[PDB]
């Protein structure tokens, strides 16, 4: 019901610190728990991921051997140790959690904490760019998969995190009521039945199948 | 006083006996092609239990299973890939019943504790917790069926049946009609209700009304019953090594599934899609596959090392799950 | 005492005798027709290549 | 000069007796395998495959020895003789190890009656099962790849090494009998058909074990100064059949004492 | 070949397997004993002396945990729920020993003992017999109606001879003299050493079971 991330990042360059997070009213011993960052203008991408039982310690390709995750199930505390701070750390950190049955991963998102310093790349392009929302109508979002996101099991990976201007994002489709998703092979379409003042926000699309879930590629559709 | 009542009751008995009585189904099914030989092989073997499992129920998606055994453990399964979805600890180790809600949100369990417990599967915080603990029966529960998301029907050894309400644990309807009720089958449309007792009899009630509609008499106690997919007939399995099929619109008996080589009772009874194969889990260390429309046995499902307790068939008829007194649950196809 | 049980018993059978009955042949024919109607989708009857290894 | 045998006439009865004993061993062990190795329900108990290992070891050893001892005077090559001697030695020490393992199992079954189901388990019953066979193989193959010029060192190291196990078996059975007697006398004091049955079952096994394995090892130990005669050779040849008699008596006794097998069949 | 979803869902099954494995070995160190005596014979006066449906009691003694199951007020067909107790270490049968004066429910107790002892499921389960309520039986010797209920039987007025005769009668009711074994304790109203007798009986039966399983027997 509540997931609080603590640790305000404002230190001199060349040092190390800890970024902690605690959960209330959760079965923390049976939850996987990722870590993500948000740049001032970018999407959401992995920086670390831990599974239940501490048997999977997958990291990110951007940084390796410097960031590490420590877990305490009896204490219900997960924290990140960072070393060799560089100039490209000015992001908002979040501690999304997930669980996998044989069912809705990335459900709850934390508040996040700041990280600032005191003073070969997958790219996607679309015919429509920054289409403004016309009042009195409904907007639809189109997307195409660069690779074959469909698996032999039929489990198409389709995540539609929506970020309102505020604190934390939410889920739309994990694989509201007005939000709907139509899929056909490599084509995906998000449809909104009715618009509202709370419907405005940024959307992000899926471009991940393998171990690194880097779905940070996404147009900013605020207007 | 007693003599007049006995004479009056005997008059009614003989009147109904003469009214409920030329052709036979087993004779009219002549000059027809039998199914042949059925020799389906085991496809999945499930482990983890260390006890004698007693009941199970297939999920509504034909992919999830629920299993309860003599140890305080209730297991949610995955028939496609063998994975333990969740394990639930029971307060009472003596359990004989299982139930999987059609919505998939709840499960039910009950045994010698005279109460039935409802567990909620899809909850926040990733935990399974008790939702209701219905009590009011003086005996041991024999079967439980989810009528809907809020209604459940329970048959116990107190010779009565109960229809409850999950929202308010008070009993909604009580059915009285002896001998211990041992099995329960729910109508496909969830409109009717049948229960077989230990007095070598079965009774069909009215869920909406609250009183018995019909009675059927065969002998020994009956401990297995199941509806036909049509909903106008059912099958019962007694302890006298005889299986029988009854029709609601006929109030009679059609044929007996018996063999001279078996003097062993029937533990579980189930059908398949279209009602062509009747699978009877016997207590002679193996199950049998009778032809519901024929008097000749078709196939045998051997491979269990103890008495077969439970037996289930998917909604789409894709697999058959069998459990026995050894802790292994097998999926056959 | 015994009068309540006596009334409860005697009232039941007389109600059961008021239900009309049809010939068992019609019910058997209906069951046979239902069985053969849905006989072309039965994986247990005809094994044709979900549970494969 | 070389292997010396008395005369052809007298070594017809010896060959006939050896053939009869081998045939009896093979048929009885085949019957035991048929009534035990059905692999249905009796495989659960570890002690049941401890006995099966002993029967398998005895049957080989008998197969690889009675047939190879009937052609004696072709020498062929030394490699074949060393190979067959190593195989026979490995089979014999594997049988002794299986006897030691089952004696240890029986000792534990009374030492810790409550913890017997946890101390002895199928996962823990295969490490010793394989370890004993590996030790048998390495101790059989040691002289071929080790120190040679068998010589008195190998002869003396194939003595005492099995004797400690043979004495530990007797010690375990003594302790079992003493504990059974103590339990019976405690029950009497609180206020026996178990102690008598256990003594009857154990006395025959122990007397057979001490009569069969005594004279042969005594002769081998005494033949340490390098002195021997034709009488010694003849008595060693005579005692060879008595030593082999284990493959005849031990599997039968071990598979017949248990009432579970009789109830099953 | 597994996906990221499936790979993370196999570790879940492994954790569940580990949890059931560690949990399943805690139920193998507890001894199961089944109470099956008459309701008014003194069961209520013996369960508390040692310290709806089935009642489970958990006791400890000599670092051994005992589970005691009392089917007190089930009032159902015993043939339909006695299967669950197959494999119980011992059955504790209790009688009042002073209900022969009802002239009879003493014959009812005899029939119940005959039915339980000769049951197919309990062909190898030991029975511990508790003859209770010695005070009234010993204090009624002045006007004991033993001759009244048995006019054709003659015996001494001493209670020891009657106790020996009735113990012999109960022992003779057994039909399996090779597997089962009936233990008699002569329990009293103010006894204290009742737990020791059952502990010794379960130790003896577990040693005999281990000997039978090992192969000596
Ligand atoms: C464990 O080895 C066994 C066990 C049972 C029977 C036969 C053998 C081996 C076969 N092998 O090692 O491949 C064998 C030897 C031999 C063995 C080890 C060390 C020295 C010799 N000698 C034999 C003569 C005939 C048949 C088999 C063997």
The CA angle B136-B141-B145, to the nearest 5 degrees, is: 95
Instruction: Name beta bridge partners: E54.
Output: E71
What homologous superfamily is domain E1-217 in, according to CATH?
P-loop containing nucleotide triphosphate hydrolases (3.40.50.300)
DSSP class of residue B111? B
Buried b (16+ CB within 10 A) or exposed e, B258-296: beeeeebbbbbbbbbbbbbbbbbbbbbbbbbbbbbbbee
Q: Which experiment gave this structure? A: cryo-EM
Q: How far apart are CA B264 and CA B243, in angstroms?
A: 11
Q: Positive or negative, the Cα torsion across E143, E144, E145, E147? A: negative
Number of H helices, E strands in chain A: 0, 15
Instruction: Name beta bridge partners: B333.
Output: none
The structure tokens listed for B137 are: 């029966």
Q: How far is CA B297 from CA B62, B120, B133, E5, in A?
A: 27, 41, 43, 45
Interchain contact, E216 vs D258, CB within 8 Å: yes
The structure tokens listed for A110 are: 């934390």
Helix (H, G, I), strand (E, B), or coil: what is residue A63?
coil
Q: How far apart are CA E160 and CA A109, in angstroms?
A: 81
Residue extents of the structural domains in chain E: 1-217
| Domain count of the fold of chain A | 2
Q: How far apart are CA A157 and CA A211, in angstroms?
A: 13
Together in a domain, A113 and A86:
yes
Q: What are phi and psi of B238, to 5 degrees?
A: -100, 175
Q: Which residue has the least CA distance to atom 28 on ligand 1?
A: D87
Q: Positive or negative, the Cα torsion across C36, C38, C44, C47? A: positive
Q: How far apart are CA C30 and CA E182, in angstroms?
A: 61
Most E CBs within 10 Å, among B140, B180, B181, to test the E interface? B140
Burial class (CB in 10 A: 0-12, 13-18, 19+), B187: middle
Q: For D94-158, give the secondary structure using H, E and C.
A: HHHHHHHHHHHHHHHHHHCCCCHHHHCCCCCCCHHHHHHHHHHHHHHHCCCCCCCCCCHHHHHHC
CATH number of the domain residue B22 falls in: 2.130.10.10
Most C CBs within 10 Å, among B35, B230, B311, to test the C interface? B230
Burial class (CB in 10 A: 0-12, 13-18, 19+), D257: middle
Facing residue for A31 by CB, picked from B78, B85, B126: B126
Together in a domain, A154 and A76:
no
Together in a domain, A147 and A182:
yes
Q: How far apart are CA B332 and CA B301, in angstroms?
A: 9
Which residue reads 């997930």 in tokens? A98
Q: How far is CA B257 from CA B28, B241, B317, in A?
A: 17, 9, 22
The resolution, in Å, is 3.3
Q: How far apart are CA A201 and CA E137, in angstroms?
A: 90
The structure tokens listed for E70 are: 């009392």
CB B203 within 8 A of CB B248: no
Helix (H, G, I), strand (E, B), or coil: what is residue D29?
helix
D90 Cβ inside 6 Å of ligand 1: yes
| Domain count of the fold of chain B | 1
Long-range contacts at E140-147 (CB < 8 A, ≥ 24 apart): E140/E98, E140/E101, E145/E101, E145/E103, E146/E100
Q: Domains (ranges, CATH) in chain C?
A: 2-53 (4.10.260.10)
CB B74 within 8 A of CB B66: yes
CATH number of the domain residue A201 falls in: 2.60.40.10
CB B249 within 8 A of CB B232: yes
Nearby residues of D142 by Cβ (< 8 Å), 6 or more positions away: D154
Q: Which domain holds residue B89?
A: 1-332
Q: Which residue of chain A comes nearest to B78, CA vs CA?
A: A102
Concatenate the DSSP letters of all residues of A160-221 into one string: --EE-SSS--B-S-B---S-EEEEETTEEEEE-SS--TT---EE------SSS-B-------
Least Cα distance to A102 among B74, B49, B121 occurs for: B121
Together in a domain, A112 and A139:
no
Interchain contact, E16 vs B112, CB within 8 Å: no
Together in a domain, A183 and A110:
no
Measured between beta carbons, which residues in chain E are less than 8 angstroms from residue D259? 212, 217
Q: How far apart are CA B296 and CA B308, in angstroms?
A: 22
Together in a domain, A12 and A109:
yes
CA D243 to the chain's CA centroid: 9
Q: Which residue has the least CA distance to atom 8 on ligand 1?
A: D87
Q: How far apart are the first and last CA of chain C?
A: 66
The structure tokens listed for B212 are: 């018995």
Least Cα distance to A158 among A137, A136, A184 occurs for: A184
Q: Which domain holds residue A189?
A: 130-221
Neighbours of chain A (3+ CB pairs under 8 A): B, E
Indicate the residue among A68, A93, A117 that finishes a domain. A117
Least Cα distance to C12 among B175, E184, B125, B42 occurs for: B175
The structure tokens listed for E84 are: 């669950």
Together in a domain, A138 and A107:
no
CB B140 within 8 A of CB B157: yes
CB B308 within 8 A of CB B267: yes
DSSP class of residue B38? B
D64 Cβ inside 6 Å of ligand 1: yes
Whether residue A124 lies inside any domain: the answer is no
Are C and D neighbours with ≥3 CB pairs closer than 8 A? no
Are D and A neighbours with ≥3 CB pairs closer than 8 A? no
CA E210 to the chain's CA centroid: 20
Together in a domain, A19 and A90:
yes
Q: Are strands B287-291 and B99-100 parallel, antiparallel or unpaired?
A: unpaired
Helix (H, G, I), strand (E, B), or coil: what is residue A131?
coil
Instruction: Name beta bridge partners: E67.
Output: E32, E58
Chain A within 8 Å of E22 (Cβ-Cβ)? no
Q: How far is CA A33 from CA A22, A94, A159, in A?
A: 11, 10, 17
């Amino acid at each position: 019901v509540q997931l609080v991330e603590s640790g305000g990042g404002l230190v001199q360059p060349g040092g190390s610190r800890k970024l902690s997070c605690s959960a209330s009213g959760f079965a923390f011993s049976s939850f996987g728990m990722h870590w993500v960052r948000q740049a001032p203008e970018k999407g959401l991408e992995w920086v670390a991921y831990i599974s239940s039982g501490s048997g999977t310690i997958y990291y990110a390709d951007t940084v390796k051997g410097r960031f590490t995750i420590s877990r305490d199930d009896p204490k219900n505390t997960l924290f990140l140790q960072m070393t060799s701070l560089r100039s490209e750390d000015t992001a908002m950190y979040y501690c999304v959690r997930s669980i996998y049955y044989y069912s809705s991963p990335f459900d709850f998102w934390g508040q996040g904490t700041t990280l600032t310093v005191s003073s070969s790349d997958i790219v996607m392009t679309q015919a429509t760019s920054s289409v403004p929302v016309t009042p009195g109508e409904s907007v639809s979002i189109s997307c195409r998969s660069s690779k074959s996101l469909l698996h032999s099991n039929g489990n198409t990976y389709l995540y539609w995190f929506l970020q309102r201007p505020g604190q934390s994002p939410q889920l739309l489709i994990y694989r509201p009521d007005r939000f709907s998703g139509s899929g056909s092979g490599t084509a995906f379409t998000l449809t909104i039945s009715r618009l509202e003042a709370e419907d405005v926000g940024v959307y992000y699309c899926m471009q991940h199948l393998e171990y690194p879930l880097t779905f940070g590629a996404g147009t900013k559709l605020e207007l | 006083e007693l003599d007049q009542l006995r004479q009056e009751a005997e008059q009614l008995k003989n009147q109904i006996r003469d009214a409920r009585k030329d052709a036979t189904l087993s004779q009219i099914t002549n000059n027809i092609d039998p199914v042949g030989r059925i020799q389906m092989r085991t496809r999945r073997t499930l482990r983890g239990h260390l006890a004698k499992i007693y009941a199970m129920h297939w999920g509504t998606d034909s992919r999830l299973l629920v299993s309860a055994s003599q140890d305080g453990k209730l297991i949610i399964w995955d028939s496609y890939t063998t994975n333990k979805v969740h394990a639930i600890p029971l307060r009472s180790s003596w359990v004989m019943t299982c139930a999987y809600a059609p919505s998939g949100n709840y499960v039910a369990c009950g045994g010698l504790d005279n109460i039935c417990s409802i567990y909620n599967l899809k909850t926040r915080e990733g935990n399974v917790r008790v939702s209701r603990e219905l009590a009011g029966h003086t005996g041991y529960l024999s079967c439980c069926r989810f009528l809907d998301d809020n209604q459940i029907v329970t048959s116990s050894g107190d010779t009565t049946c109960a229809l409850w309400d999950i929202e308010t644990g008070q009993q909604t309807t009580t059915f009285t009609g002896t001998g211990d009720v041992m099995s329960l089958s729910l109508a496909p449309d969830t409109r009717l209700f049948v229960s077989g007792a230990c007095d070598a009899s079965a009774k069909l009630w009215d869920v909406r009304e609250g009183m018995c509609r019909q009675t059927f008499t065969g002998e020994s106690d009956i401990n297995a019953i199941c509806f036909f997919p049509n909903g106008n007939a059912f099958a019962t399995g007694s302890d006298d090594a005889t299986c029988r099929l009854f029709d609601l619109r006929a109030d009679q008996e059609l044929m007996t599934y018996s063999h001279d080589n078996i003097i062993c009772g029937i533990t579980s009874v189930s059908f398949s899609k279209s009602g062509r194969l009747l699978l009877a889990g016997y207590d002679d260390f193996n199950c049998n596959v009778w032809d519901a429309l024929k008097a000749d046995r078709a196939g045998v499902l051997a491979g269990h090392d103890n008495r077969v307790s439970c037996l289930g068939v998917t909604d789409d008829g894709m697999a058959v799950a069998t459990g026995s007194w050894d802790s292994f649950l097998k999926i056959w196809n | 005492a015994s009068i309540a049980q006596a009334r409860k018993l005697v009232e039941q059978l007389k109600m059961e005798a008021n239900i009309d009955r049809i010939k068992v042949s019609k019910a058997a024919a209906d069951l046979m027709a239902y069985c053969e109607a849905h006989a072309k989708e039965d994986p247990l009857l005809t094994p044709v290549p979900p549970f494969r290894e | 000069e070389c292997f010396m045998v008395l005369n052809p006439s007298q070594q017809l009865a010896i060959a006939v007796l050896s053939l009869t004993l081998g045939t009896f061993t093979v048929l009885e062990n085949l019957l035991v395998l048929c009534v035990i190795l059905h692999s249905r329900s009796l495989r659960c108990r570890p002690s049941y495959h401890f006995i099966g290992s002993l029967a398998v070891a005895d049957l080989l050893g008998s197969v690889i020895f009675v047939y190879s001892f009937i052609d004696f005077h072709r020498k062929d090559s030394r490699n074949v003789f060393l190979f067959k001697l190593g195989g026979v030695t490995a089979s014999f020490t594997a049988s002794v190890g299986s006897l030691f393992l089952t004696a240890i199992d029986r000792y534990i079954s009374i030492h810790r009656p409550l913890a017997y189901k946890r101390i002895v388990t199928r996962p823990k019953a295969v490490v010793a099962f394989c370890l004993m066979w590996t030790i048998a193989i390495v101790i059989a193959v040691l002289p071929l790849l080790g120190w040679n010029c068998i010589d008195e060192t190998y002869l003396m190291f194939w003595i005492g090494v099995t004797s400690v196990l043979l004495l530990f078996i007797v010690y375990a059975y003594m302790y079992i009998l003493w504990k059974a007697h103590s339990h019976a006398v405690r029950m009497i004091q609180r206020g026996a058909r178990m102690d008598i049955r256990l003594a009857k079952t154990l006395v025959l096994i122990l007397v057979v074990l001490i009569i069969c394995w005594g004279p042969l090892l005594a002769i081998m130990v005494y033949d340490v100064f390098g002195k021997m005669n034709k009488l010694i050779k003849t008595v060693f040849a005579f005692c060879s059949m008595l030593c082999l008699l284990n493959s005849t008596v031990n599997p039968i006794i071990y598979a017949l004492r248990s009432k579970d097998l009789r109830h099953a069949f | 070949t597994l996906s990221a979803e499936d790979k993370a869902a196999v570790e879940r099954s492994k954790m569940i397997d580990r949890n059931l494995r560690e949990d399943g070995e805690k139920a193998a160190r507890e001894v199961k004993l089944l109470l099956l005596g008459a309701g008014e014979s003194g069961k209520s006066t013996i369960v508390k002396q040692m310290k709806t449906g089935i009642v489970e009691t958990h006791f400890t003694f000599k670092d051994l945990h005992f589970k005691m199951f009392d089917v007190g007020g089930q009032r159902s067909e015993r043939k339909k729920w006695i299967h669950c107790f197959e494999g119980v270490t011992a059955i504790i049968f209790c009688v009042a020993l002073s209900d022969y004066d009802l002239v009879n429910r003493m014959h009812e107790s005899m029939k119940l003992f005959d039915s339980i002892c000769n049951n197919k499921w309990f062909t190898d389960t030991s029975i511990i017999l508790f003859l209770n309520k010695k005070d009234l039986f010993e204090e009624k010797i002045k006007k004991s109606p033993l001759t009244i209920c048995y006019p054709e039987y003659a015996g001494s007025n001493t209670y020891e001879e009657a106790a020996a005769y009735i113990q012999c009668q109960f022992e003779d009711l057994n039909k399996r003299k090779d597997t089962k074994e009936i233990y008699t304790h002569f329990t009293c109203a103010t006894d204290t050493k009742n737990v020791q007798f059952v502990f010794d009986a379960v130790t003896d039966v577990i040693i005999k079971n281990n000997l039978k399983d090992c192969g000596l027997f």
